[PDB]
């Protein structure tokens, strides 16, 4: 149907649409986390900044997947963006752990998208996933794990002083 | 009860949560339009840029309303962002017309929020709506109307030459 | 009658005079708190700086209300500035809590001034209150609530280590 | 017998020589199109410049492939660069269509080279093809499609004005 489409399986196009939805959902979760930390009864402003930045970055990765869909002659098909599963994120340690899990899920779905690209012999799609998503997911997961470890060693969440100082020193 | 809450009725808290979801919906619609215009068989780069900037601006307003919710002692409650009821926006003129109607609906809902706010003797929320949304939406609807009028006067949608030149001279 | 007076009822003139005295009272309380934190047996320099700046800001608002009184054709009538009902503010957390309540009271009195202003069909005074006081007091109360929340979460007032570090990392 | 040769299959060597020829040919086609638009009876200056830049870039791609052949220890075997199919390219839209077809063909043989390379477990050759050729081809095809779409929507080739305005706005 598209004059530019070449070597671009319809499974790959649907999988790209689903991945776009996933990146937008991650962006939504991060947004809710961020403004949770903006509440006057939490007031961890750098946690808020950190999560809001990650939310904009997930939105950027969704926009790049939409660009990629148009680049391949695919056609973008958007779904509802589900609300996050929680509205109260308990603590900075618990937010960081939910984000760790969220990035692990996103990575796993990216790895399935890669294996689909490879078994459909679409090396452009495989290398796009590699170059723009795979190492970024690994760096994100490593950094979240670092934060989780530090918060836990400092005595979070029972130690609110721990979360305050982490907000000041690591997220500052 | 919040330690900062003062003169913030529950109706306006809920209407703010609804307005947050509405502004997130608006940016979703603009994002869909933007990448429709990035398709290989549409290829109007400045229409795409225009709607992507509108998208980001709507997201910034949603975040501003979240900030106000937290500022007022309210609780942010996020619901699903409904997918745009359209996939193919047909043309630049039709996209501008749909944006005009979207913004008009957002505007009347903002006025209903303001009417509720002044009904409940909450002058900070009313002036906030005024200050940060009312004239912004008026200018936005006026701009979109100008865009619609120009594209129509130029021969859109029958002549793709009109849409091409509007994309270059106005959206450029 | 003034040569410039127009649509300035006597109730709002008197309420402006009362608000002038209230804002002078607020700055007096902040000044007392500031130098409490300068005592040799308290010695939290940035708490002191913070409350002295709040004091000067309240004095600037009192002077702004005086300027508005003169602008509207009214007569400034000054009454005694009542001494703060406390000498010893006990701790940084308790000082922040007292400031939170002070500002909350000032805010509801500002809303009563606005309600009177819109009762009397005086839209300039109402928008002036909005513009120059309503969102300022909202931001102030939110900031003080954040401060209270952090100091509490950090272990104040039991651990003077929390107050020391808050003084360094947040008020610094 | 190359002292540097390692994991470089004789089929990979030959396929690289064929790709070198194909890129020099793409360069020749672009050169012929560019000087067709420099004709006094066509005289579309920016079409000319665009296709000259495409020709210089295609020959840089050829030289990168020759350098790759040497890095891997294979041997450059060059062949005739065939003259293009057409001397007269008819119009700007027809030229853009021929360019789109030509680049889709270059892309198909690049994908075949990647399949060969991964069939021979030559991951260096694969990743080289990926990062220096495959996304550049995907972007080139997307861009030519966009151009064709605009020429068509504007009413080319029947409207000489459409191609004039496209020359001035998109290509200038
Ligand atoms: Ca790769
Ligand atoms: Ca429809
Ligand atoms: Ca006492
Ligand atoms: Ca020949
Ligand atoms: Ca690879
Ligand atoms: Ca280019
Ligand atoms: Fe991501
Ligand atoms: Fe991510
Ligand atoms: Fe808006
Ligand atoms: Fe808007
Ligand atoms: Fe004040
Ligand atoms: Fe104040
Ligand atoms: Fe090439
Ligand atoms: Fe090329």
XYZ file of C-alpha atoms and ligand atoms in Angstrom:
702
model
C 0.000 0.000 0.000
C 2.952 2.288 0.832
C 5.560 3.230 -1.773
C 8.372 3.027 0.809
C 7.514 -0.271 2.507
C 10.210 -2.895 2.011
C 10.945 -6.048 3.996
C 8.562 -4.963 6.761
C 6.353 -7.741 8.087
C 2.822 -6.995 9.259
C 3.704 -8.688 12.570
C 6.551 -6.173 12.917
C 4.145 -3.280 12.276
C 1.663 -4.503 14.897
C 4.515 -5.184 17.335
C 5.811 -1.639 16.817
C 2.334 -0.242 17.515
C 2.167 -2.262 20.729
C 5.642 -1.089 21.751
C 4.584 2.530 21.149
C 1.662 1.964 23.509
C 4.042 0.488 26.082
C 6.412 3.472 25.947
C 3.529 5.901 26.357
C 2.300 3.853 29.333
C 5.725 3.975 30.953
C 5.716 7.742 30.406
C 2.321 7.928 32.167
C 3.569 5.904 35.135
C 6.649 8.092 35.519
C 4.483 11.222 35.346
C 2.253 9.951 38.157
C 5.298 9.042 40.265
C 6.842 12.478 39.698
C 3.835 14.440 40.830
C 3.348 12.028 43.725
C 6.682 13.290 44.999
C 5.445 16.873 44.450
C 2.764 16.420 47.126
C 3.216 18.530 50.238
C 3.124 15.348 52.380
C 6.104 13.809 50.554
C 8.033 16.854 49.240
C 10.981 15.083 47.610
C 11.546 17.595 44.808
C 14.502 15.904 43.152
C 12.694 12.556 43.039
C 9.948 14.499 41.295
C 12.463 15.975 38.840
C 14.109 12.609 38.218
C 10.798 10.892 37.496
C 9.505 13.777 35.354
C 12.651 13.694 33.227
C 12.297 9.920 32.791
C 8.672 10.536 31.819
C 9.661 12.961 29.068
C 12.336 10.518 27.915
C 9.852 7.653 27.612
C 7.541 9.965 25.623
C 10.523 10.703 23.354
C 11.138 6.995 22.784
C 7.464 6.533 21.868
C 7.685 9.436 19.401
C 10.765 7.817 17.846
C 8.921 4.519 17.438
C 6.111 6.385 15.668
C 8.743 7.986 13.431
C 10.160 4.513 12.728
C 6.720 3.143 11.828
C 6.256 5.909 9.269
C 9.832 5.390 8.040
C 9.083 1.743 7.228
C 5.764 2.309 5.492
C 3.909 0.922 8.491
C 0.818 2.643 9.830
C 0.528 3.930 13.388
C -2.394 2.609 15.424
C -2.867 4.046 18.903
C -4.707 2.497 21.814
C -5.906 3.824 25.134
C -3.087 4.607 27.540
C -4.046 2.696 30.671
C -3.813 4.491 33.983
C -1.010 3.297 36.285
C -1.881 0.483 38.681
C -1.175 2.642 41.750
C -1.972 6.275 42.543
C 0.038 6.399 45.806
C 3.651 5.287 45.385
C 4.350 4.742 49.105
C 8.006 5.848 49.172
C 11.038 6.772 47.101
C 12.429 3.264 47.495
C 9.093 1.822 46.423
C 8.789 4.171 43.461
C 12.315 3.198 42.437
C 11.441 -0.507 42.707
C 8.261 -0.118 40.649
C 10.314 1.720 38.023
C 12.885 -1.087 38.068
C 10.085 -3.581 37.383
C 8.584 -1.327 34.693
C 11.892 -1.061 32.837
C 12.416 -4.814 33.121
C 9.031 -5.395 31.461
C 9.719 -2.804 28.734
C 13.118 -4.408 28.097
C 11.598 -7.893 27.880
C 9.069 -6.683 25.332
C 11.901 -4.973 23.395
C 13.812 -8.265 23.355
C 10.748 -10.057 21.984
C 10.464 -7.334 19.328
C 14.101 -7.921 18.430
C 13.654 -11.681 18.121
C 10.596 -11.100 15.945
C 12.620 -8.731 13.744
C 15.407 -11.307 13.437
C 13.210 -14.309 12.720
C 11.497 -12.156 10.060
C 14.994 -11.206 8.764
C 14.534 -7.483 9.141
C 18.044 -6.374 10.118
C 17.079 -2.710 9.901
C 14.408 -3.187 12.585
C 16.721 -5.334 14.725
C 19.513 -2.751 14.560
C 17.124 0.118 15.243
C 15.940 -1.665 18.398
C 19.561 -2.368 19.377
C 20.983 1.082 18.716
C 18.192 3.176 20.190
C 16.564 1.078 22.868
C 18.610 -1.896 24.076
C 21.612 -0.257 25.698
C 19.421 2.587 26.945
C 17.234 0.012 28.711
C 20.308 -1.685 30.169
C 21.706 1.631 31.417
C 18.293 2.559 32.852
C 17.904 -0.792 34.624
C 21.451 -0.584 36.022
C 20.863 2.946 37.328
C 17.534 2.041 38.922
C 19.162 -0.970 40.604
C 21.923 1.326 41.892
C 19.350 3.699 43.361
C 17.418 0.814 44.923
C 20.577 -0.535 46.560
C 21.595 2.880 47.899
C 18.167 3.644 49.350
C 18.096 0.233 51.020
C 21.589 0.470 52.514
C 20.783 3.968 53.866
C 17.843 2.553 55.844
C 14.965 3.565 53.567
C 11.987 3.624 53.705
C 11.796 3.451 57.509
C 14.445 6.205 57.421
C 12.909 9.342 55.958
C 16.268 10.986 56.588
C 17.699 8.431 54.144
C 15.267 9.443 51.402
C 15.835 13.142 52.071
C 19.617 12.849 51.875
C 19.427 10.614 48.757
C 17.156 13.197 47.123
C 19.747 15.857 48.012
C 22.967 13.954 47.181
C 22.264 11.489 44.389
C 19.270 13.065 42.659
C 20.635 16.596 43.242
C -6.869 16.390 55.508
C -3.844 18.206 54.049
C -1.752 20.553 56.139
C -1.923 23.029 53.223
C -5.520 22.560 52.085
C -7.652 25.687 52.486
C -10.883 26.604 50.642
C -10.529 23.770 48.097
C -13.928 22.116 47.686
C -14.090 18.488 46.551
C -16.044 19.271 43.361
C -13.238 21.458 42.022
C -10.618 18.893 43.058
C -12.479 16.288 40.999
C -12.963 18.727 38.111
C -9.221 19.440 38.154
C -8.533 15.705 37.935
C -10.946 15.554 34.981
C -9.238 18.542 33.355
C -5.862 16.839 33.766
C -7.216 13.826 31.874
C -8.734 16.128 29.255
C -5.438 17.960 28.629
C -3.587 14.652 28.383
C -6.220 13.570 25.852
C -5.691 16.800 23.902
C -1.950 16.213 23.658
C -2.577 12.602 22.583
C -4.803 13.812 19.742
C -2.201 16.382 18.686
C 0.524 13.702 18.748
C -1.532 11.434 16.521
C -2.154 14.294 14.082
C 1.531 15.209 14.071
C 2.692 11.778 13.026
C -0.140 11.398 10.535
C 1.487 14.355 8.762
C 4.870 12.546 8.931
C 3.517 9.608 6.879
C 5.253 9.030 3.570
C 1.981 9.577 1.685
C 1.249 12.915 3.394
C 4.688 14.385 4.019
C 3.876 17.909 5.262
C 6.794 18.448 7.633
C 5.659 21.735 9.181
C 2.123 20.503 9.871
C 3.843 17.676 11.723
C 6.073 20.077 13.672
C 3.114 22.334 14.498
C 0.970 19.553 15.914
C 3.903 18.039 17.873
C 4.505 21.413 19.538
C 0.800 21.714 20.311
C 1.049 18.219 21.835
C 3.924 19.158 24.126
C 2.153 22.387 25.138
C -0.952 20.448 26.162
C 1.194 18.047 28.175
C 2.785 21.026 29.944
C -0.687 22.285 30.858
C -1.723 18.897 32.189
C 1.402 18.971 34.340
C 0.579 22.534 35.423
C -2.852 21.367 36.590
C -1.196 18.484 38.438
C 1.095 21.035 40.098
C -1.933 23.114 41.081
C -3.703 20.057 42.500
C -0.699 19.344 44.707
C -0.403 23.053 45.561
C -3.980 23.169 46.790
C -3.800 20.066 48.980
C -5.783 17.897 46.589
C -5.110 14.364 45.406
C -4.205 13.662 41.779
C -6.313 10.756 40.493
C -5.374 9.640 36.981
C -7.748 7.806 34.641
C -7.012 6.247 31.262
C -6.169 8.577 28.394
C -8.685 7.655 25.702
C -7.201 7.006 22.254
C -8.143 9.582 19.608
C -11.383 8.775 17.812
C -9.567 8.921 14.441
C -6.446 7.307 12.958
C -6.332 9.010 9.576
C -6.790 12.771 9.716
C -7.483 13.015 5.959
C -5.791 16.381 5.341
C -4.176 19.453 6.848
C -7.397 21.466 6.678
C -9.383 18.663 8.293
C -6.722 18.275 10.975
C -6.906 22.023 11.733
C -10.718 21.831 11.901
C -10.591 18.899 14.311
C -8.067 20.802 16.452
C -10.360 23.839 16.410
C -13.240 21.724 17.743
C -11.030 19.959 20.285
C -9.779 23.273 21.673
C -13.310 24.705 21.673
C -14.504 21.768 23.801
C -11.525 22.082 26.141
C -12.369 25.779 26.445
C -15.994 25.332 27.409
C -14.939 22.708 29.964
C -12.429 25.237 31.350
C -15.240 27.767 31.644
C -17.358 25.191 33.502
C -14.419 24.660 35.855
C -14.231 28.430 36.388
C -17.989 28.700 36.965
C -17.760 25.957 39.580
C -14.753 27.731 41.123
C -16.562 31.043 41.515
C -19.692 29.204 42.672
C -17.644 27.755 45.543
C -16.022 31.067 46.613
C -12.521 29.939 45.544
C -10.947 33.029 43.964
C -7.402 31.680 43.652
C -8.529 28.740 41.512
C -10.664 31.062 39.384
C -7.878 33.568 38.770
C -5.465 30.683 38.140
C -7.790 29.317 35.450
C -8.108 32.856 34.027
C -4.384 33.690 34.108
C -3.023 30.385 32.811
C -5.764 28.948 30.576
C -8.534 31.328 29.506
C -6.639 33.764 27.293
C -4.298 30.968 26.166
C -7.258 28.956 24.855
C -8.774 32.078 23.297
C -5.544 32.792 21.415
C -5.267 29.113 20.429
C -8.794 28.933 19.033
C -8.272 32.220 17.167
C -5.017 30.946 15.648
C -6.637 27.673 14.573
C -9.529 29.599 13.038
C -7.093 31.742 11.070
C -5.380 28.563 9.876
C -8.704 27.035 8.814
C -9.675 30.245 6.992
C -6.393 30.484 5.107
C -6.356 26.835 3.999
C -9.974 27.139 2.855
C -9.364 30.430 1.003
C -6.319 28.867 -0.683
C -8.290 26.053 -2.327
C -7.847 23.296 0.241
C -8.569 20.465 0.352
C -9.113 20.004 -3.393
C -5.683 21.399 -4.330
C -2.765 19.874 -2.456
C -0.814 22.882 -3.719
C -2.632 25.050 -1.149
C -1.736 22.700 1.715
C 1.887 22.490 0.536
C 2.278 26.282 0.358
C 0.482 26.934 3.669
C 2.831 24.380 5.249
C 5.786 26.323 3.844
C 4.702 29.979 4.278
C 2.617 29.922 7.449
C 3.716 26.879 9.397
C 7.315 27.628 8.400
C -13.917 62.938 49.221
C -10.786 62.147 47.186
C -10.318 63.479 43.685
C -9.241 59.948 42.668
C -11.681 57.839 44.683
C -14.039 55.778 42.522
C -15.954 52.598 43.473
C -14.050 52.136 46.758
C -16.565 51.245 49.469
C -15.735 52.054 53.093
C -15.860 48.409 54.236
C -13.016 47.444 51.906
C -11.034 50.546 52.886
C -11.293 49.456 56.525
C -10.495 45.838 55.633
C -7.399 47.037 53.764
C -6.300 48.951 56.862
C -6.837 45.756 58.882
C -4.870 43.737 56.323
C -2.016 46.242 56.537
C -1.884 45.684 60.300
C -2.090 41.924 59.770
C 0.846 41.882 57.322
C 2.905 44.038 59.676
C 2.065 41.533 62.420
C 3.166 38.670 60.161
C 6.545 40.274 59.527
C 6.945 40.932 63.268
C 6.365 37.243 64.001
C 8.849 36.230 61.301
C 11.430 38.674 62.707
C 11.054 37.212 66.178
C 11.461 33.684 64.801
C 14.514 34.719 62.794
C 16.405 36.035 65.778
C 15.300 33.142 67.963
C 17.276 30.991 65.513
C 20.270 33.362 65.907
C 20.477 32.644 69.663
C 23.708 31.055 70.816
C 21.819 28.005 72.117
C 19.965 27.422 68.827
C 22.424 28.585 66.185
C 20.719 27.518 62.932
C 21.943 30.275 60.625
C 19.832 29.430 57.572
C 16.595 29.135 59.553
C 17.420 32.634 60.757
C 18.073 33.886 57.215
C 14.885 32.242 55.925
C 12.630 33.822 58.525
C 14.296 37.259 58.148
C 13.599 37.163 54.404
C 10.011 36.123 55.079
C 9.820 39.098 57.468
C 11.005 41.582 54.857
C 8.632 40.092 52.263
C 5.667 40.572 54.594
C 6.728 44.163 55.227
C 6.865 44.738 51.461
C 3.301 43.437 51.175
C 2.100 45.692 53.967
C 3.663 48.588 52.076
C 2.027 47.373 48.853
C -1.373 47.460 50.567
C -0.593 50.958 51.841
C 0.242 51.937 48.257
C -3.066 50.473 47.086
C -4.973 52.339 49.801
C -3.458 55.610 48.613
C -4.038 54.599 44.978
C -7.730 54.054 45.603
C -8.362 57.328 47.429
C -8.603 55.721 50.852
C -7.047 56.783 54.136
C -4.349 54.671 55.788
C -5.181 54.227 59.483
C -2.468 52.418 61.440
C -3.105 50.531 64.681
C -0.586 48.957 67.042
C 1.347 45.943 65.801
C 0.670 43.284 68.426
C 3.766 41.518 69.776
C 4.036 37.837 68.827
C 2.273 35.526 71.261
C 5.527 33.570 71.781
C 9.120 34.458 72.701
C 10.759 31.054 72.434
C 9.895 29.159 69.267
C 11.193 25.842 70.673
C 12.593 24.417 67.419
C 12.873 24.753 63.660
C 9.995 22.347 63.038
C 7.777 24.157 65.531
C 8.722 27.501 63.999
C 7.777 26.202 60.523
C 4.458 24.887 61.886
C 3.651 28.229 63.500
C 4.510 29.989 60.222
C 2.249 27.562 58.356
C -0.663 28.458 60.651
C 0.116 32.178 60.515
C 0.120 32.158 56.711
C -3.046 30.040 56.632
C -4.836 32.632 58.791
C -3.521 35.499 56.670
C -4.792 33.607 53.624
C -8.330 33.109 54.853
C -8.452 36.788 55.839
C -7.287 37.654 52.302
C -10.107 35.523 50.923
C -12.587 37.358 53.173
C -11.222 40.629 51.794
C -11.736 39.294 48.261
C -15.267 38.095 49.053
C -16.112 41.546 50.393
C -14.522 43.099 47.290
C -16.621 41.071 44.865
C -19.685 41.597 47.067
C -19.247 45.354 46.588
C -18.763 45.237 42.781
C -15.109 46.365 43.001
C -13.290 44.278 40.382
C -9.962 46.119 40.499
C -9.517 45.425 44.217
C -10.502 41.787 43.690
C -8.080 41.223 40.821
C -5.391 43.102 42.764
C -5.856 40.736 45.712
C -5.780 37.790 43.269
C -2.733 38.952 41.286
C -0.556 40.093 44.187
C -1.601 37.947 47.166
C -3.674 34.847 46.408
C -1.189 32.714 44.485
C 1.683 34.136 46.558
C 0.041 32.897 49.767
C -0.792 29.565 48.131
C 2.848 29.061 47.141
C 3.981 30.187 50.610
C 1.702 27.767 52.446
C 2.748 24.938 50.108
C 6.437 25.688 50.702
C 5.953 25.783 54.478
C 4.061 22.492 54.326
C 6.915 20.910 52.389
C 9.326 22.211 55.026
C 7.195 20.785 57.842
C 6.951 17.425 56.048
C 10.689 17.170 55.454
C 11.676 18.090 59.021
C 9.139 15.595 60.374
C 10.252 12.810 57.999
C 13.878 13.486 58.975
C 13.336 12.775 62.677
C 12.699 16.282 63.977
C 12.330 17.446 66.633
C 13.825 14.541 68.597
C 17.080 14.523 66.600
C 18.778 17.894 66.270
C 20.765 16.245 63.480
C 17.671 16.458 61.246
C 17.227 20.180 61.933
C 20.942 20.828 61.357
C 20.961 19.014 58.000
C 17.669 20.545 56.801
C 19.142 23.955 57.661
C 22.172 23.116 55.517
C 20.634 21.248 52.539
C 17.243 22.897 52.105
C 17.513 26.324 53.665
C 21.014 26.640 52.196
C 46.445 -14.706 1.193
C 45.953 -11.563 3.293
C 47.821 -11.278 6.611
C 44.814 -9.338 8.000
C 42.056 -11.595 6.669
C 39.936 -13.257 9.348
C 36.421 -14.724 9.199
C 35.981 -13.126 5.760
C 34.272 -15.520 3.361
C 35.021 -15.524 -0.386
C 31.300 -14.929 -1.046
C 31.384 -11.864 1.247
C 34.378 -10.533 -0.741
C 32.550 -10.962 -4.072
C 29.297 -9.495 -2.739
C 31.212 -6.450 -1.483
C 32.694 -5.958 -4.957
C 29.185 -6.145 -6.418
C 27.935 -3.611 -3.876
C 30.809 -1.249 -4.750
C 29.706 -1.409 -8.395
C 26.083 -0.811 -7.444
C 26.957 2.314 -5.444
C 29.131 3.770 -8.215
C 26.158 3.129 -10.508
C 23.740 4.929 -8.165
C 26.236 7.807 -8.215
C 26.244 7.830 -12.037
C 22.445 7.809 -12.219
C 22.252 10.771 -9.830
C 24.846 12.654 -11.883
C 22.867 12.094 -15.086
C 19.622 13.271 -13.435
C 21.329 16.345 -12.008
C 22.657 17.543 -15.332
C 19.301 16.808 -16.905
C 17.824 19.454 -14.600
C 20.590 21.913 -15.659
C 19.270 21.754 -19.222
C 18.147 25.076 -20.651
C 14.734 23.500 -21.454
C 14.274 22.118 -17.937
C 16.270 24.585 -15.858
C 15.298 23.412 -12.351
C 18.367 24.568 -10.433
C 17.616 22.996 -7.069
C 16.617 19.624 -8.558
C 20.030 19.753 -10.222
C 21.830 20.524 -6.936
C 19.868 17.902 -5.006
C 20.760 15.110 -7.447
C 24.404 16.279 -7.578
C 24.602 16.000 -3.783
C 23.011 12.538 -3.996
C 25.673 11.550 -6.551
C 28.590 12.761 -4.399
C 27.128 10.943 -1.387
C 26.605 7.688 -3.346
C 30.225 7.757 -4.473
C 31.349 8.329 -0.849
C 29.339 5.197 -0.002
C 31.247 3.404 -2.771
C 34.599 4.471 -1.342
C 33.583 3.432 2.173
C 32.810 -0.023 0.760
C 36.192 -0.153 -1.017
C 37.907 0.780 2.246
C 35.899 -1.943 4.026
C 37.039 -4.442 1.387
C 40.642 -3.565 2.181
C 40.180 -3.591 5.978
C 38.938 -7.180 5.805
C 41.823 -8.221 3.562
C 39.784 -8.867 0.425
C 40.626 -7.515 -2.997
C 38.951 -4.707 -4.944
C 37.753 -5.977 -8.293
C 36.092 -3.107 -10.135
C 33.826 -3.363 -13.160
C 32.269 -1.107 -15.763
C 29.931 1.524 -14.361
C 26.931 1.196 -16.571
C 25.287 4.208 -18.076
C 21.804 4.912 -16.661
C 18.641 3.573 -18.293
C 17.558 7.054 -19.392
C 19.216 10.101 -20.915
C 16.074 12.266 -20.651
C 14.374 12.090 -17.267
C 11.073 13.680 -18.433
C 10.239 15.629 -15.249
C 10.987 16.249 -11.591
C 8.347 13.798 -10.403
C 9.487 11.089 -12.846
C 13.089 11.618 -11.749
C 12.066 11.330 -8.097
C 10.166 8.085 -8.836
C 13.162 6.596 -10.655
C 15.357 7.585 -7.687
C 12.938 5.929 -5.260
C 12.920 2.720 -7.338
C 16.717 2.787 -7.689
C 17.215 3.231 -3.931
C 14.752 0.431 -3.140
C 16.864 -1.785 -5.387
C 20.132 -0.678 -3.712
C 18.439 -1.425 -0.381
C 17.303 -4.887 -1.475
C 20.823 -5.892 -2.435
C 22.194 -4.402 0.815
C 19.717 -6.565 2.749
C 20.872 -9.573 0.740
C 24.466 -8.688 1.655
C 23.469 -8.623 5.312
C 21.730 -11.990 5.035
C 24.865 -13.404 3.391
C 27.093 -11.935 6.116
C 25.069 -13.375 8.985
C 24.749 -16.704 7.187
C 28.570 -16.774 7.105
C 28.765 -15.711 10.798
C 30.538 -12.482 9.850
C 29.178 -10.171 12.556
C 31.629 -7.388 11.715
C 30.351 -7.336 8.122
C 26.730 -7.425 9.311
C 27.123 -4.540 11.767
C 29.085 -2.490 9.229
C 26.285 -2.915 6.670
C 23.739 -2.046 9.382
C 25.218 1.092 10.865
C 26.685 2.632 7.700
C 24.134 1.655 5.087
C 20.773 0.372 6.221
C 19.298 3.286 8.159
C 20.716 5.692 5.590
C 18.865 3.752 2.895
C 15.662 3.719 4.959
C 15.906 7.511 5.385
C 16.712 7.980 1.692
C 13.651 5.967 0.676
C 11.420 7.809 3.150
C 12.674 11.159 1.787
C 12.187 10.264 -1.869
C 8.693 8.986 -1.028
C 7.887 12.265 0.709
C 9.137 14.152 -2.348
C 7.155 12.018 -4.799
C 4.061 12.453 -2.623
C 4.465 16.243 -2.654
C 5.137 16.485 -6.393
C 2.024 14.374 -6.945
C -0.252 16.249 -4.527
C 0.883 19.550 -6.090
C -0.226 18.351 -9.527
C 3.098 17.458 -11.123
C 4.083 16.826 -13.781
C 1.173 18.520 -15.641
C 1.666 21.752 -13.637
C 5.121 23.160 -14.392
C 4.413 25.630 -11.596
C 4.196 22.768 -9.096
C 7.719 21.582 -9.963
C 8.971 25.198 -9.961
C 7.570 25.832 -6.463
C 8.857 22.500 -5.197
C 12.285 23.352 -6.579
C 12.189 26.660 -4.726
C 10.665 25.570 -1.381
C 11.518 21.918 -0.678
C 14.805 21.723 -2.553
C 16.058 25.310 -2.103
Ca 23.846 -3.875 15.545
Ca -13.902 8.324 11.094
Ca 3.599 29.510 74.967
Ca 26.071 -0.634 -21.447
Ca 23.497 -7.561 14.271
Ca 18.945 14.097 2.675
Fe 11.922 3.206 26.844
Fe 12.851 3.078 29.363
Fe -4.939 23.501 26.376
Fe -4.975 24.440 24.181
Fe 1.828 37.653 53.178
Fe 2.817 35.479 53.186
Fe 23.750 4.671 -1.160
Fe 21.152 6.403 -1.108
